[PDB]
Structure formats: C-alpha cells, structure tokens
Design a protein around this motif. Structure first.
Motif, PDB file in Angstrom:
ATOM      1  N   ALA B  22      16.506  27.976  30.889  1.00 29.72           N
ATOM      2  CA  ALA B  22      16.935  26.583  30.777  1.00 29.72           C
ATOM      3  C   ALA B  22      18.358  26.387  31.276  1.00 29.72           C
ATOM      4  CB  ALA B  22      16.813  26.120  29.333  1.00 29.72           C
ATOM      5  N   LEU B  23      18.666  25.164  31.695  1.00 31.73           N
ATOM      6  CA  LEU B  23      19.991  24.836  32.213  1.00 31.73           C
ATOM      7  C   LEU B  23      20.840  24.085  31.193  1.00 31.73           C
ATOM      8  CD1 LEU B  23      21.656  24.787  34.994  1.00 31.73           C
ATOM      9  CD2 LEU B  23      20.774  22.474  35.216  1.00 31.73           C
ATOM     10  N   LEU B  24      22.066  24.556  30.967  1.00 35.28           N
ATOM     11  CA  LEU B  24      22.973  23.887  30.030  1.00 35.28           C
ATOM     12  C   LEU B  24      23.544  22.710  30.804  1.00 35.28           C
ATOM     13  CD1 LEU B  24      24.790  26.952  28.530  1.00 35.28           C
ATOM     14  CD2 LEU B  24      22.662  25.842  27.831  1.00 35.28           C
ATOM     15  N   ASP B  25      23.169  21.503  30.398  1.00 30.53           N
ATOM     16  CA  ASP B  25      23.582  20.313  31.120  1.00 30.53           C
ATOM     17  C   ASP B  25      24.389  19.308  30.305  1.00 30.53           C
ATOM     18  OD1 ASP B  25      23.694  17.946  32.637  1.00 30.53           O
ATOM     19  OD2 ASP B  25      21.838  18.474  33.668  1.00 30.53           O
ATOM     20  N   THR B  26      25.709  19.315  30.483  1.00 26.13           N
ATOM     21  CA  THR B  26      26.574  18.397  29.753  1.00 26.13           C
ATOM     22  C   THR B  26      26.377  16.931  30.151  1.00 26.13           C
ATOM     23  OG1 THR B  26      28.417  18.751  31.309  1.00 26.13           O
ATOM     24  CG2 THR B  26      28.314  20.171  29.373  1.00 26.13           C
ATOM     25  N   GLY B  27      25.670  16.698  31.251  1.00 25.84           N
ATOM     26  CA  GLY B  27      25.429  15.331  31.685  1.00 25.84           C
ATOM     27  C   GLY B  27      24.191  14.712  31.056  1.00 25.84           C
ATOM     28  N   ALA B  28      23.456  15.509  30.289  1.00 28.30           N
ATOM     29  CA  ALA B  28      22.242  15.035  29.630  1.00 28.30           C
ATOM     30  C   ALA B  28      22.460  14.741  28.150  1.00 28.30           C
ATOM     31  CB  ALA B  28      21.141  16.074  29.781  1.00 28.30           C
ATOM     32  N   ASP B  29      22.058  13.553  27.700  1.00 32.27           N
ATOM     33  CA  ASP B  29      22.205  13.209  26.281  1.00 32.27           C
ATOM     34  C   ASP B  29      21.178  14.008  25.485  1.00 32.27           C
ATOM     35  OD1 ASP B  29      24.010  11.242  27.073  1.00 32.27           O
ATOM     36  OD2 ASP B  29      22.834   9.572  26.277  1.00 32.27           O
ATOM     37  N   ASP B  30      19.998  14.169  26.080  1.00 33.53           N
ATOM     38  CA  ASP B  30      18.875  14.852  25.443  1.00 33.53           C
ATOM     39  C   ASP B  30      18.397  16.127  26.126  1.00 33.53           C
ATOM     40  OD1 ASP B  30      18.634  12.539  23.652  1.00 33.53           O
ATOM     41  OD2 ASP B  30      17.716  11.523  25.367  1.00 33.53           O
ATOM     42  N   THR B  31      17.510  16.826  25.431  1.00 36.19           N
ATOM     43  CA  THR B  31      16.935  18.072  25.921  1.00 36.19           C
ATOM     44  C   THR B  31      15.508  17.781  26.370  1.00 36.19           C
ATOM     45  OG1 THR B  31      18.308  19.464  24.492  1.00 36.19           O
ATOM     46  CG2 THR B  31      16.198  20.383  25.209  1.00 36.19           C
ATOM     47  N   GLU B  65      16.130  28.577  19.940  1.00 37.34           N
ATOM     48  CA  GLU B  65      17.240  29.504  20.073  1.00 37.34           C
ATOM     49  C   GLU B  65      17.786  29.361  21.491  1.00 37.34           C
ATOM     50  OE1 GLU B  65      16.759  33.864  19.673  1.00 37.34           O
ATOM     51  OE2 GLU B  65      16.642  33.453  17.514  1.00 37.34           O
ATOM     52  N   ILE B  66      19.101  29.216  21.605  1.00 33.77           N
ATOM     53  CA  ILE B  66      19.753  29.061  22.901  1.00 33.77           C
ATOM     54  C   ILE B  66      20.803  30.155  23.040  1.00 33.77           C
ATOM     55  CG2 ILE B  66      21.097  27.512  24.372  1.00 33.77           C
ATOM     56  CD1 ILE B  66      19.972  25.208  22.473  1.00 33.77           C
ATOM     57  N   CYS B  67      20.597  31.077  23.977  1.00 36.95           N
ATOM     58  CA  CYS B  67      21.533  32.181  24.166  1.00 36.95           C
ATOM     59  C   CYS B  67      21.713  32.935  22.853  1.00 36.95           C
ATOM     60  CB  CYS B  67      22.890  31.665  24.644  1.00 36.95           C
ATOM     61  SG  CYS B  67      22.950  31.270  26.380  1.00 36.95           S
ATOM     62  N   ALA B  71      19.192  26.771  16.591  1.00 41.23           N
ATOM     63  CA  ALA B  71      19.324  25.322  16.516  1.00 41.23           C
ATOM     64  C   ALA B  71      17.991  24.760  16.049  1.00 41.23           C
ATOM     65  CB  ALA B  71      19.685  24.739  17.891  1.00 41.23           C
ATOM     66  N   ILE B  72      18.006  23.518  15.584  1.00 39.17           N
ATOM     67  CA  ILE B  72      16.790  22.843  15.134  1.00 39.17           C
ATOM     68  C   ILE B  72      17.004  21.387  15.469  1.00 39.17           C
ATOM     69  CG2 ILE B  72      15.273  22.236  13.231  1.00 39.17           C
ATOM     70  CD1 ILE B  72      16.424  24.601  11.658  1.00 39.17           C
ATOM     71  N   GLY B  73      16.243  20.861  16.417  1.00 40.24           N
ATOM     72  CA  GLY B  73      16.455  19.468  16.765  1.00 40.24           C
ATOM     73  C   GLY B  73      15.347  18.834  17.567  1.00 40.24           C
ATOM     74  N   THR B  74      15.689  17.719  18.191  1.00 44.30           N
ATOM     75  CA  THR B  74      14.741  16.973  18.992  1.00 44.30           C
ATOM     76  C   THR B  74      14.560  17.541  20.388  1.00 44.30           C
ATOM     77  OG1 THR B  74      15.208  14.946  17.776  1.00 44.30           O
ATOM     78  CG2 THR B  74      14.203  14.720  19.949  1.00 44.30           C
ATOM     79  N   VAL B  75      13.304  17.736  20.767  1.00 45.55           N
ATOM     80  CA  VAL B  75      12.972  18.250  22.084  1.00 45.55           C
ATOM     81  C   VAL B  75      12.034  17.249  22.752  1.00 45.55           C
ATOM     82  CG1 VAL B  75      11.848  20.095  23.355  1.00 45.55           C
ATOM     83  CG2 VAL B  75      13.209  20.649  21.339  1.00 45.55           C
ATOM     84  N   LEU B  76      12.286  16.945  24.020  1.00 39.02           N
ATOM     85  CA  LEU B  76      11.445  16.016  24.768  1.00 39.02           C
ATOM     86  C   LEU B  76      10.632  16.820  25.782  1.00 39.02           C
ATOM     87  CD1 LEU B  76      14.126  13.247  25.546  1.00 39.02           C
ATOM     88  CD2 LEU B  76      12.665  13.502  23.529  1.00 39.02           C
ATOM     89  N   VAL B  77       9.343  16.520  25.885  1.00 37.72           N
ATOM     90  CA  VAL B  77       8.468  17.226  26.815  1.00 37.72           C
ATOM     91  C   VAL B  77       7.956  16.263  27.884  1.00 37.72           C
ATOM     92  CG1 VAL B  77       6.390  18.647  27.054  1.00 37.72           C
ATOM     93  CG2 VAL B  77       7.767  18.780  24.970  1.00 37.72           C
ATOM     94  N   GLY B  78       8.236  16.580  29.145  1.00 43.45           N
ATOM     95  CA  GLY B  78       7.800  15.712  30.227  1.00 43.45           C
ATOM     96  C   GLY B  78       7.978  16.299  31.615  1.00 43.45           C
ATOM     97  N   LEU B  90      23.602  21.167  22.544  1.00 46.47           N
ATOM     98  CA  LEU B  90      24.831  21.884  22.888  1.00 46.47           C
ATOM     99  C   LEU B  90      25.821  21.746  21.736  1.00 46.47           C
ATOM    100  CD1 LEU B  90      25.247  20.803  26.601  1.00 46.47           C
ATOM    101  CD2 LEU B  90      24.334  22.962  25.731  1.00 46.47           C
ATOM    102  N   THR B  91      25.801  20.594  21.072  1.00 43.86           N
ATOM    103  CA  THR B  91      26.698  20.380  19.941  1.00 43.86           C
ATOM    104  C   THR B  91      26.339  21.293  18.773  1.00 43.86           C
ATOM    105  OG1 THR B  91      25.323  18.502  19.210  1.00 43.86           O
ATOM    106  CG2 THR B  91      27.281  18.004  20.542  1.00 43.86           C
ATOM    107  N   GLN B  92      25.048  21.551  18.592  1.00 42.97           N
ATOM    108  CA  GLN B  92      24.618  22.420  17.503  1.00 42.97           C
ATOM    109  C   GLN B  92      25.066  23.870  17.681  1.00 42.97           C
ATOM    110  OE1 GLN B  92      20.690  22.258  15.822  1.00 42.97           O
ATOM    111  NE2 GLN B  92      20.471  20.046  16.164  1.00 42.97           N
ATOM    112  N   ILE B  93      25.216  24.327  18.925  1.00 42.67           N
ATOM    113  CA  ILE B  93      25.654  25.700  19.150  1.00 42.67           C
ATOM    114  C   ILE B  93      27.170  25.801  19.338  1.00 42.67           C
ATOM    115  CG2 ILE B  93      23.422  26.239  20.179  1.00 42.67           C
ATOM    116  CD1 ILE B  93      24.807  26.264  22.907  1.00 42.67           C
TER     117      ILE B  93
END
Ligand SMILES: COC(=O)N[C@H](C(=O)NN(CCC[C@@]1(Cc2ccccc2)C(=O)N([C@H]2c3ccccc3C[C@H]2O)C[C@H]1O)Cc1ccc(-c2ccccc2)cc1)C(C)(C)C
Lengths: 99, 99
Positions: B22-31, B65-67, B71-78, B90-93
């Motif tokens: 996965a790509l760590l993207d600071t420009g994305a509000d969501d995952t 788990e990221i790196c 974490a435990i949160g909202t994930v979007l699938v599309g 990113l804030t959670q880690i």
C-alpha cells in the motif's frame, strides 16, 4: 518543521509570480496544478488517479518556492480538482514521512 | 522510521490476515483498497479523485496493520489503481511530515 496530519497538509507556494495553495501529497509522483500559464516548452501527458485519467501539460525545470525553500522541478498543469505538490518537489525540500 | 520520497512510499500492510502492498498518501483523507472481502455490513460512499468520482463500499472499525503498527478504522473498498493509506489511518500510527 513538523506537520501533523489531523488536517489536510496545505501550504502556500510561489510559482510563476503567483501565490497558490497546494496539498503536500506523498502519493503523487509529480506536482499537479489547476490551469495556469508557465513559460518554456511542454508536452501532453495523461495521468490516472481515482475516478479515471485527465490530460495535462508537462513543464520541466520550473522554479518554485515552498515553505521558504526555493526548489526546481516538473509541474503538470490541467483540470485537477485540487492543487497537489508531489514527490518530485517534496524531495528537494528534504520532506520525509516519520512515525 | 523515516521514509524519504525519492521512490513511492510503498509499505506492507496486513488486513484480514493477508499481506498487501500500500501507498502512504498524505493527500488522501481516506483509505481505499482494491477489491477484497471484509466482514460485517458496509455503507455507501462517493469519493472524488483527480479523475472524477467513484462509488466505494465503506467498512468501519476494521483492524489493519501498517508497517507493523496496529490500527483499527474505516476502510473503503473500490476501483483504485493502488491501495492507498489515507490520513484517517496515518494519524493512528503517529505519522507526520517533516522537513
Ligand atoms: C477529499 O478527497 C480525498 O482526499 N480524495 C483522495 C484523493 O484522490 N486525493 N487527492 C490526492 C491523491 C491523488 C493520487 C491518488 C492515488 C494514489 C496511489 C495510486 C493511484 C492514485 C493521484 O490521483 N495520483 C496520480 C498522479 C499525480 C501526479 C502525477 C502522476 C499521477 C498518476 C497518479 O498516480 C497520485 C496521488 O497523488 C487530492 C484530492 C482532494 C480533493 C478532491 C475533491 C475535489 C472536489 C470535490 C471532491 C473531492 C480531489 C483530489 C481519495 C484517494 C480518497 C479519492
């Protein structure tokens, strides 16, 4: 300095004598800005993100100032919904992700 | 750790017991992740990207788990060209931008 990610990491940049707000985007390979004028040569290119592809004009060796840091790099200009600063310029200012 | 941006900030994540890139993207509000299976019910969401808008399936309170960081949160699938980790996670880690 240290920029938290609780909010969108927006910064003010100086380019082509203009001041614009842009998002620091670690996910973007290059910087992409809304329609504007830039000097020099350019070549058409297609970039694809979420939602599909858009056509942009690629300008190279464009001077840009971010957070007081004067850097040079590639700028893609086109119908992007938001201004984004990509890795090609983030590296020049010594920007890194830390956790 | 500290990640430079000369190359795409790709990392390994773990979701549903499976490892993915996965790509760590600071420009994305969501995952947003590529098509996969997740438990429970999902809600609809429309997100906008550089190319337009796409419909995604929203799953909440999902362990990821990221790196190595939990974490435990909202994930979007599309329909996304790549798995992207957004600011919500990113804030959670404890990830931040530094320069
Ligand atoms: C609020 O919305 C978001 O945070 N959206 C995220 C998003 O795209 N964010 N981009 C920021 C992220 C865009 C990303 C996503 C990506 C990452 C990995 C693999 C493929 C694609 C993108 O499109 N990228 C492309 C790009 C850029 C430069 C040069 C080449 C290329 C090719 C692609 O890789 C890279 C990232 O920057 C900024 C943005 C903000 C608000 C609106 C809006 C404007 C008006 C109305 C509604 C939204 C539209 C766009 C999602 C990932 C969650 C969709």
């Amino acid at each position: 300095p240290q920029i938290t990610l609780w909010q969108r990491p927006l910064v003010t940049i100086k380019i082509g004598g203009q001041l614009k707000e842009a998002l620091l985007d670690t996910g973007a390979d290059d910087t992409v800005l809304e329609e504007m004028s830039l000097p020099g040569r350019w070549k058409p290119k297609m970039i694809g993100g979420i939602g599909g592809f858009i056509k942009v004009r690629q300008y190279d060796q464009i001077p840009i100032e971010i957070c007081g840091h004067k850097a040079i790099g590639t700028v893609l200009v086109g119908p992007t919904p938001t201004n984004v600063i990509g890795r090609n310029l983030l590296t020049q200012i010594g920007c890194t992700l830390n956790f």
